[PDB]
């Protein structure tokens, strides 16, 4: 936004991907915002948990979620209408969902 660009030391570096919720709606889907003095690193169908929340902690409570990028510090994410309401508190990280080689043989089959 300005040309400033802070002088601190470095912090950010490896290891998963975070962010802060600095406000977030009720809705079915639900439009939510990141922190000032945080990035988002998620596309639409990434997925992301809550950490600590106030009021709608159930999010939390009930494994990660798909999320919807509306923006740069925009986006939304599934049907948050089944919890309570947002009060405070709420960390979007970047859960580790599978991603492996995954796969399933119920029948028989050795030699064709």
């Known amino acids: 936004e ?3 660009e802070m002088v601190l030391t ?5 290891q998963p991907l975070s962010a ?3 406000m977030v709606t009720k809705d079915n889907p639900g ?3 990141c922190l ?6 998620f596309e639409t169908g990434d997925f992301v948990s809550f950490s600590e929340v106030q009021g709608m902690i159930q999010l939390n409570g009930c494994q990660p979620m798909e999320i919807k990028v509306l923006g ?4 939304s994410i599934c ?3 089944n919890f309570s309401d947002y009060i405070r508190g709420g960390i979007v990280s970047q859960v ?4 492996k080689i995954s796969f399933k043989s119920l029948p028989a089959s050795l030699v064709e």
Do not use: I, Q
């Not at 470095?10 to 490896?14: F, H, I, L, V």
């Not at 000032?36 to 690193?41: I, L, M």
């Not at 580790?96 to 991603?99: D, E, L, R, S």
């Open 36 to 41: 000032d003095e945080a990035r988002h690193g």
């Open 79 to 81: 049907d948050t209408s």
């Open 96 to 99: 580790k969902v599978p991603k």
């Open 10 to 14: 470095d912090s950010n570096g490896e």
């Open 72 to 75: 740069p510090y925009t986006f």
């Open 31 to 33: 439009v939510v915002t």
């Open 20 to 22: 802060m919720v600095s």
């Open 2 to 4: 300005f040309g400033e």
